[PDB]
Each structure stands twice: as C-alpha cells, then as structure tokens.
Amino acid sequence: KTAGXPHKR
Amino acid sequence: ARRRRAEVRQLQPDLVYGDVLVTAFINKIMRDGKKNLAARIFYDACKIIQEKTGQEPLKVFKQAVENVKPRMEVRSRRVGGANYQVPMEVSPRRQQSLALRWLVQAANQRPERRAAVRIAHELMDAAEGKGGAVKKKEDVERMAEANRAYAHYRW
Amino acid sequence: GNKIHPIGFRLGITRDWESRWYAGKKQYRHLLLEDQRIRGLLEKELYSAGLARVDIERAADNVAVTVHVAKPGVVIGRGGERIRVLREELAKLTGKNVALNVQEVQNPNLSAPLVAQRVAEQIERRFAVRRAIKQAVQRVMESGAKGAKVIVSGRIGGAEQARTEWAAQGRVPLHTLRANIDYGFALARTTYGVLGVKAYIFLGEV
Amino acid sequence: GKGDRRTRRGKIWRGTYGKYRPR
Amino acid sequence: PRSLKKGVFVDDHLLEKVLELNAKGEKRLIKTWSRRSTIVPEMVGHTIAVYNGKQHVPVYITENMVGHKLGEFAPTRTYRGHG
Amino acid sequence: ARKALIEKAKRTPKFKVRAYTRCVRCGRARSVYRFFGLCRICLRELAHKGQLPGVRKASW
RNA sequence: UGAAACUCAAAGGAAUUGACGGGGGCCCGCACAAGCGGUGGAGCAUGUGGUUUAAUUCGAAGCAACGCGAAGAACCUUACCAGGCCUUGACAUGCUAGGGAACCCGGGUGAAAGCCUGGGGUGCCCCGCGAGGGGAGCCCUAGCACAGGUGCUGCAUGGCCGUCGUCAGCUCGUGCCGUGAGGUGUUGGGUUAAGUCCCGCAACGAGCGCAACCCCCGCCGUUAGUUGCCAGCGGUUCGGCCGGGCACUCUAACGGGACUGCCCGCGAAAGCGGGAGGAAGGAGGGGACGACGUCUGGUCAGCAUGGCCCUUACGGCCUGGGCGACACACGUGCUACAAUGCCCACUACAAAGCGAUGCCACCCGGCAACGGGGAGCUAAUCGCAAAAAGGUGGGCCCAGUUCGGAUUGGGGUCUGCAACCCGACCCCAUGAAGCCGGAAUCGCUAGUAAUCGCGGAUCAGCCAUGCCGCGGUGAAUACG
Ligand SMILES: [Mg+2]
Ligand SMILES: [Mg+2]
Ligand SMILES: [Mg+2]
Ligand SMILES: [Mg+2]
Ligand SMILES: [Mg+2]
Ligand SMILES: [Mg+2]
Ligand SMILES: [Mg+2]
Ligand SMILES: [Mg+2]
Ligand SMILES: [Mg+2]
Ligand SMILES: [Mg+2]
Ligand SMILES: [Mg+2]
Ligand SMILES: [Mg+2]
Numbered sequence A: 001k002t003a004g005x006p007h008k009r
Numbered sequence B: 001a002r003r004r005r006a007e008v009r010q011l012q013p014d015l016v017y018g019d020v021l022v023t024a025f026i027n028k029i030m031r032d033g034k035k036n037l038a039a040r041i042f043y044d045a046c047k048i049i050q051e052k053t054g055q056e057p058l059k060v061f062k063q064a065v066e067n068v069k070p071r072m073e074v075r076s077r078r079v080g081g082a083n084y085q086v087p088m089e090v091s092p093r094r095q096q097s098l099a100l101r102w103l104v105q106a107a108n109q110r111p112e113r114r115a116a117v118r119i120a121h122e123l124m125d126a127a128e129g130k131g132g133a134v135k136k137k138e139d140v141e142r143m144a145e146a147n148r149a150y151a152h153y154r155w
Numbered sequence C: 001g002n003k004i005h006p007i008g009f010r011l012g013i014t015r016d017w018e019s020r021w022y023a024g025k026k027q028y029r030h031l032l033l034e035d036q037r038i039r040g041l042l043e044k045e046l047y048s049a050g051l052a053r054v055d056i057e058r059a060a061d062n063v064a065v066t067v068h069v070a071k072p073g074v075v076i077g078r079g080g081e082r083i084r085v086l087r088e089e090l091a092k093l094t095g096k097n098v099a100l101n102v103q104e105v106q107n108p109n110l111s112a113p114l115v116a117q118r119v120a121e122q123i124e125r126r127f128a129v130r131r132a133i134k135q136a137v138q139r140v141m142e143s144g145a146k147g148a149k150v151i152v153s154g155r156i157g158g159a160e161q162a163r164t165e166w167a168a169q170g171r172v173p174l175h176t177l178r179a180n181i182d183y184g185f186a187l188a189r190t191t192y193g194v195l196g197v198k199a200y201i202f203l204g205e206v
Numbered sequence D: 001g002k003g004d005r006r007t008r009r010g011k012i013w014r015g016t017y018g019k020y021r022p023r
Numbered sequence E: 001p002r003s004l005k006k007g008v009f010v011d012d013h014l015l016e017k018v019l020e021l022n023a024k025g026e027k028r029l030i031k032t033w034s035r036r037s038t039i040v041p042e043m044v045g046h047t048i049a050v051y052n053g054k055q056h057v058p059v060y061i062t063e064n065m066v067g068h069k070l071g072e073f074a075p076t077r078t079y080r081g082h083g
Numbered sequence F: 001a002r003k004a005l006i007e008k009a010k011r012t013p014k015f016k017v018r019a020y021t022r023c024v025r026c027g028r029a030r031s032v033y034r035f036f037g038l039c040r041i042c043l044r045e046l047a048h049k050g051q052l053p054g055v056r057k058a059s060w
Numbered sequence G: 001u002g003a004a005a006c007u008c009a010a011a012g013g014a015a016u017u018g019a020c021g022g023g024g025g026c027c028c029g030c031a032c033a034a035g036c037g038g039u040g041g042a043g044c045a046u047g048u049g050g051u052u053u054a055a056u057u058c059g060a061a062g063c064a065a066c067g068c069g070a071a072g073a074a075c076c077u078u079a080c081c082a083g084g085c086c087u088u089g090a091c092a093u094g095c096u097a098g099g100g101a102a103c104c105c106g107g108g109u110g111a112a113a114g115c116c117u118g119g120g121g122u123g124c125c126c127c128g129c130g131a132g133g134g135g136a137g138c139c140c141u142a143g144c145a146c147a148g149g150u151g152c153u154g155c156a157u158g159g160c161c162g163u164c165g166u167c168a169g170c171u172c173g174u175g176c177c178g179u180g181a182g183g184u185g186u187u188g189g190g191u192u193a194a195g196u197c198c199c200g201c202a203a204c205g206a207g208c209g210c211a212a213c214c215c216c217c218g219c220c221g222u223u224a225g226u227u228g229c230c231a232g233c234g235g236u237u238c239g240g241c242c243g244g245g246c247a248c249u250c251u252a253a254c255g256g257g258a259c260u261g262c263c264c265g266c267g268a269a270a271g272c273g274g275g276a277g278g279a280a281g282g283a284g285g286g287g288a289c290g291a292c293g294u295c296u297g298g299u300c301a302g303c304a305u306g307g308c309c310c311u312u313a314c315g316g317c318c319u320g321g322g323c324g325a326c327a328c329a330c331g332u333g334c335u336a337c338a339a340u341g342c343c344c345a346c347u348a349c350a351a352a353g354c355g356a357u358g359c360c361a362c363c364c365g366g367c368a369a370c371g372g373g374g375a376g377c378u379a380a381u382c383g384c385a386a387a388a389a390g391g392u393g394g395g396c397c398c399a400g401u402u403c404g405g406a407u408u409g410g411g412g413u414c415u416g417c418a419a420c421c422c423g424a425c426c427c428c429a430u431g432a433a434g435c436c437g438g439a440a441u442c443g444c445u446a447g448u449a450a451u452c453g454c455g456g457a458u459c460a461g462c463c464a465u466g467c468c469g470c471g472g473u474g475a476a477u478a479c480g
C-alpha cells in the first residue's frame, strides 16, 4: 500500500 | 465559429505592386515568420519570370492564380449516418485560398534546386494551363462532376 | 480546496503587512527569521490575553513589536510588570532595542482571529459545534458588522466520518477587493484529532 | 545543427565558446 | 578528469599502507573503502580489497592498469542478464 | 530521519560541499530559496499571511 | 377447476428530487469542421511500467499519474543496501549525582565515525593578606523522566492543492401550493460572455457566484531631470565627450480617458446592427480572482494531528554502495533527416532580469575550455552582453553530403576533500541511425501558431534538451 520501514512492499 | 462567422483579415498591400493578392501569396511562401526571406523569394522569381517569357510579372501571377481557382469541389454531408461526396460551388474567398495554397505546394514539389526558380516555373506553367497545381485543380473539378448524382443534397 | 486566502489577496489594498520594514538581500532572511522567532514567543504567551495581531517595524538594531489584544491586562501586568518581564526576555533573543507596545482591540467580536479562537476553544470544551458557530456569527452581526461566516472542518462531535459545517449572515464577498474582510484561523486539538476553524468578518467596503 | 558542438550554432546552443565560436 | 595542476589524488591513508609494505617487504591484503584512489606504480604486485558497497573485492595490481582508479576493478552491480 | 537531519544541517560540515540549504521553518531540504531561507510552501503560507515585508501577489 | 412442500423480507401502487438515454428542443467551448505546425518511425534527454538488484528509498495511476513532489541525487541531500560504530542519544525541556568542568589547540588507532586520550585554565557573591572552600553561564560523565521514527492508517483528520469549471450555476427568508418528499421564487418571451439585464408572472425580497473595485499593456496630462535623454546653440582627443538644457525618448508616482455617452435604423424594453468622433468601441488585449458542492481525488514524505506500531532500534553517526541497473514497453521533450538549407567572415535591431568568499571590463599565455594579471560597480553609473533569426559578401551543389551529430579512442580544462561507479566543458580523431515516420494521436483563432535567441530561480559544479519568465520575426484559416 505504501513502503516505509518494515512494510516493504 | 458557432456564434458569429469570423471576419476576413485584410492584408497590407505589398510595397512593390501595391496588391493584396501578392501579399497573400507571399504569406503562403513564408515559413517560421521569415517574411523577409519569403518576399525576397517571390520577387527574385518575378525577375526570372520577366527574363524568361518577357510578359509583365504581375500579369503572369494573376492569370496563373485564375487558372488554379476551382469552381466546384466535393464536401461531406449527412442524411442519416451516410457520408456523401456532395459537389459544392466554391466561394471566392476559398477559390483564392486553395489556388494560392496549391501553387506553393506544387512549386515545392518541383525539381529545381532553388526556391524562386520553382515558383517562377510553376507560375509560368500555371499561367499556360500546365503544372501540378492546375492538375490538382482539374482533379478537384472532376470529383465534383462525377458525384453530380448527389448534387441534390447541396445546401 | 480552491478558495484563495482573503488577506494575501488584499495586501497592499485593504490589508497591510504585519511586518513593515525594508532590508537588502544580505540580511533579509536573518531579520525575517527574527520576526518569526519573536512572533513565535508572543503568540505562545499572550494567547491568554487574546492576541489578535503582531505588528513589527524596524530601523536599525531596534524594533517596534506593536501587540494588539482584547485584554491589555495580561500584557502590562502589575503596573507594567509582565510588560517588562516579557520585554526583558524579548530583547534577550533580539539583542536589540525592543520597544513593546500594547494596543486595545475596539470590539473583540469584530476581530476574525478572536472569533475563531473563541470557537476553537469552545469545541475543545466539547460544546455543540453547530450551535457555537451560529452564536459566533450572531455575536459578530450584533457587533454591527455587515456580514460574517464561520467554518469548522473535521470530526465534528468526534464522529469517525469527517465533516464540514458552517453558518453565515449578511454578506461576505470574497471576490471583492475594496471589501474589508478580516480573516482568521484557529486550530482546536481534541481527544480525537485536529479540527480547523475559519472566521470571516465583513467590516465594510472602502 | 544546434546539436554539433564543433560548429558555431552548437556553441551558441550550449552557451559555450571555443575555436568554433570565440570572443 | 582531475586538473593535473592538482595532484594525482590518493587518500593518503591508503598510500600510507602501500609504502610501509614496500619498506617492510610486502605482501599483505589491503582492505580499503577508498574507491576514489588512483592506482599508482607503488601498488604494482599487491592485491587490494576494494569495497563495492557490500564486499571488499580483491584486485591484483598489474602494470597495464596503473593509471586507473581503484573502483574500476570492483564492479558495483550484479546483473547476469534477463530471461 | 528528520530532526537529526534538520540539526545536522546547521552543524559545520567536514567539507564545504556537504553543506546544503534547509528551510528554517519546516525543515525542507528541497525548493529552498536563499533569499527567504524558506521553502516554496512556507514562503506561500507567510506571503498570504502578510508576514513577509513588501512581498505580494504579482499580476501582469 | 386448482393446491402444497420449500423459500424470501420483501413483492408492489402513485408521486418527488436527481442522474442517465444510440429521446426532443434551444445554446455554447480549438469539440468537429477550415487551416498551420507537430507527436507516433530515428538518435539522444528526462519521467514511468516492467524486470533486475544487497539496495535499485518513498510518493503520484485515465482525463485531473508519467521533464509530476525534485526551483539542481558524485559525498551531502538520502528516506534504501552493506559494513564499522553510538544507547537520555544529533535535538527538546525537568530532576538529581560525581567530576566539579568553561573555551582553543593537539596525540594514538581507525575508511571515517568512534574509542582511547594532553595540553591553554571559570566571571557571580563571597570567608579573601591565610590554605582557600563553596554558589553559578556552560561543559563532561552516571542515572532517571523522556526524546527520536521520511514506520502504517489521506477509509480517523487539519491545512493546502488538483478537478469538474471561469462552467452559470447553488441557495436562503417570509408568503403561496401540496397529506407528504417537495414545488414556486430560479419557470416562461427577449437578451447577454454570464441566474447579464428587460418584460411577464403567487410571488416579494435577499446571500454565495457573475460583473465591478486590483495589476500589466495601448493614447494623453501632471510632478520630477541623475546614473537616463541631446531638440537647438558652444566647444569637441571626434565618445553626449565637456558647457548647457529637460524639449524629446525614458524612468516612476498621481491623474485624465470609453459611458453603447452621440447619430441613423430595429425594439415594448433591455439590447442588437451600422456610422461619427477618438490612441482605443461595444467587457479595448492579457492577468489576479475559482459559487454550494463532486471525485471516501492528492498529500500522515513540507508542516500539523487522533490512533496503531519500533525503543542498545523501524531511533543516531560514519565510510562505501544504490537512487543513474537494462532482454524490454509507454509518456513528455531536444536535435535532425537538408538548398526557404549547412558553413565561414563581416554588419546591424530587443526586452526582462542578475551581480561584494558576485558580476568581472581590459590586457597577456593558450587552437580552446581556461589560467594569470587586473580596473569599475555596494550598481538607470561598472559588468553579465554576444542578443539570435536578420543584412552584406563568400563557399558547398542534391551526395547519407560541407545534411545529421549518436557512438567510441586519445588528449586536456574547471568545480569540488573527492568526478571508477556517476559531472560539465574544450581540443584531435570517430561520423551511427535517420531520405519526413504504420494503426493512431496533439496544440493553436492574432502579435496567436511557427520560428529565433535572452534572463532567472535551484545552484560548488552540474547531466536544464526541464520550469517560470522576456522580447525579436511573424502567418494560415473559420462556409458552417
Ligand atoms: Mg485512549
Ligand atoms: Mg556539420
Ligand atoms: Mg550567459
Ligand atoms: Mg536511519
Ligand atoms: Mg518530524
Ligand atoms: Mg549543495
Ligand atoms: Mg536546497
Ligand atoms: Mg386462486
Ligand atoms: Mg414509478
Ligand atoms: Mg435529459
Ligand atoms: Mg483539424
Ligand atoms: Mg497536417
């Protein structure tokens, strides 16, 4: 939905 | 052009012959705003056209314009979703415009290396009834003669 | 998402700058940062006095800082105590001659930044937003103004769906330049996030 | 044309100078 | 390239390690992060571990590669094609 | 990586190249006018606000 | 004639407000038509998809994402990756505690950060001849409280923006009609760029919009005359250069000026056509300005902010790498395919801006980039500066060329600590595709399109062919 840190993507 | 029909721009007559039709023809020669170069080409050919065939240059020009004005052309109309070729009479404004336009284009299709010679010879051949611009006029006049069956759709 | 700011639209016409001075490209930023750094401290403190404006003027190593306000009390203090206690701390950052003044606000309910702050504060206390708006507009018109409009935007009442609600009376012609329209914004923080209050007060045409 | 650095028009186009457009 | 009015640029802290080796009777593996260093004739014969962002890449130094830079021989991207 | 970066910008850098502009107000590293020391966004907010001396909306 | 089991939370009638129609009517917009130049093919620039990658940070997604956030990614920026480090921390306030530091220069190691370290030596007020002991800017370390996060949610938000759309609209108060949603007003005739006005009417008013007030341009005046101007006398190294002057050009503040005010005609009126005068005529040309609302449009990465998550780590410093990858596919662009062209030399005419670790005249070295000298100007003064197209003369002669300038070898210059990845520029050599572009598709109605150059922001430099501006030359066409 939107990469940024841990969430990556 | 929904509301009112546009007005026809009046052109500053040329600084030699004092003729608007000459100014209009130079504007069709002009590319990228180089009216100086444009007018220079047109006048150099007037020299050529007075040397070869010693008639008056301006006189040859106008007669060539007359021999290229088409009096009839095909347009499109509806009656359902159909697309007819309808023969229409050409307005004086449009006769002049198409005559001037086809001349430059026919001139630039010629094989002479420099621009004034192409315009000199095309204006010569046109004033005698030959040349691509005249072949283009007769071609247009033919297509309106053939589709004369659909002339009853004219407005 | 389209309308332009009503003050910056009229600057040099119906509204004048809140910082009046000249400078050159050498120290313009240094002075402008000082104005902002100074104006930061003032709005932080004099809030409880209802600060409606900060005017700045400059010559050289000196500064005006004319503070308009609804209640000069919290500014001056005891015989001019707070007015000193702040002017002390003031030039403690300016390092210049900082001559603080205090102008009274004629009608506070005719000032846009005040009307917005009274509504922003009222809704932090969990007051009926729809009502607080109509009342504020009602006060400004009772104060003689020729028109007033007030906008609160966000999670009204704490609803999950954000919303915009407003009221207006008289006339507020934002497209008109000769129309003196005071504009002011106040931001209300709540348990559930930020709301935004726009106040428009139409004083008259000049 | 304007894309050839080794001519005057090219030097004009990139706003430079050299043997092919000096001062 | 660099103006020759300036020097042929080496980070010094690497040229230091090179010269002490020549004095002491080299060799020794040389780990550097200075890709920007220019290869220099005192480096001929050694092997230098040049960092490429992820690894120190050994590079045996030969005469024909003397004028170049260190990073030229520690490629920085792995590719091996598509499809 | 924000506050540590807005602070590192004020610091004197090991080399004069590593120095970069930075909005004094919000901290943008991009679209920073030397004249105001602001960024294009804060510049617009203060101009509409009238807190920028002499500046106004241009029209021609 | 005529069931039931089973199944549903409805199936329905009329009417209302919309939206939609390959319904109708009446209008409009570069919507088509009429034109002129392009894009789609080529090479390159730049953005994107995709793949690849340790990482190729994140966002943006039909119009309205795609030279967009980026008005400047080699380091920094930088949010990603690798590795070496820091743990009240780079930063905020507050509490103690030890040292009891202030500040400025060093040393060892190390890629650096860091870790380890050594010198120059504290003002308040004081007991002061005494040893001095404390108190305190501020520092250092220890320990708390807390900081920090460009981690997530734009389906929790503010603010701001895009958009429909500069489209003519969206409404309210009272009254009237209707059981009611709601209607009327806002419909109707005429009119206009416009819910712009006129007339009519169970409507009468009013608000947000439209227009206007604001800015640039066009004519005229006034006030000003230096750094700007030179009409006329006087000198004149012949340069407005000196005397002189402000006339003019200008520059920049304030005014004048246009109102369909006048004539003719049509008309019920508002207006419409035409004409006069005038620099300008029917809103003079351009700008700023964007209704109630829509897209659960965009932005938690400019900032703010609820909530969720990370806390020797999703925080922090560093060096290096990546953001510039490349079987491919798309967008936006630059340069071209030539003779209305290309090249060389000479010679003209702008506007808006910019300029004290700035612009840099002029001189010398160098083919040159540039270097070295070296005036002037805090700049209507001095500089950027050459404007280019154009004008004159000369060369090329239809060729993949004296078209085109990609690619690549070699040699340099400049900025910068540093140009391997991955800079711009100069010089020698190289001299690719490309012969005007398939299906398809874009812009523009006049000082416009096309073409020609100029400046600025960002900025050390710069990948800018981008953006915002500026003037020079200057068209075609609109039946409908
Ligand atoms: Mg809670
Ligand atoms: Mg060539
Ligand atoms: Mg220049
Ligand atoms: Mg980090
Ligand atoms: Mg932050
Ligand atoms: Mg920088
Ligand atoms: Mg910046
Ligand atoms: Mg039955
Ligand atoms: Mg029905
Ligand atoms: Mg319909
Ligand atoms: Mg067309
Ligand atoms: Mg065409």
Ligand SMILES: [Mg+2]
Pocket (backbone or CB within 6 Å): none
């Ligand atoms: Mg082009």
Ligand SMILES: [Mg+2]
Pocket (backbone or CB within 6 Å): none
């Ligand atoms: Mg293609």
Ligand SMILES: [Mg+2]
Pocket (backbone or CB within 6 Å): none
């Ligand atoms: Mg292409």
Ligand SMILES: [Mg+2]
Pocket (backbone or CB within 6 Å): none
């Ligand atoms: Mg991406």
Ligand SMILES: [Mg+2]
Pocket (backbone or CB within 6 Å): none
């Ligand atoms: Mg990708």
Ligand SMILES: [Mg+2]
Pocket (backbone or CB within 6 Å): none
């Ligand atoms: Mg994405």
Ligand SMILES: [Mg+2]
Pocket (backbone or CB within 6 Å): none
């Ligand atoms: Mg777009």
Ligand SMILES: [Mg+2]
Pocket (backbone or CB within 6 Å): G072
């Ligand atoms: Mg850039």
Ligand SMILES: [Mg+2]
Pocket (backbone or CB within 6 Å): G078
């Ligand atoms: Mg980097």
Ligand SMILES: [Mg+2]
Pocket (backbone or CB within 6 Å): none
């Ligand atoms: Mg780094």
Ligand SMILES: [Mg+2]
Pocket (backbone or CB within 6 Å): G154
């Ligand atoms: Mg939204």
Ligand SMILES: [Mg+2]
Pocket (backbone or CB within 6 Å): none
């Ligand atoms: Mg929003």
Ligand SMILES: [Mg+2]
Pocket (backbone or CB within 6 Å): G153, G155
């Ligand atoms: Mg959600």
Ligand SMILES: [Mg+2]
Pocket (backbone or CB within 6 Å): G166, G193, G194
């Ligand atoms: Mg309009």
Ligand SMILES: [Mg+2]
Pocket (backbone or CB within 6 Å): none
């Ligand atoms: Mg609408």
Ligand SMILES: [Mg+2]
Pocket (backbone or CB within 6 Å): none
């Ligand atoms: Mg509608």
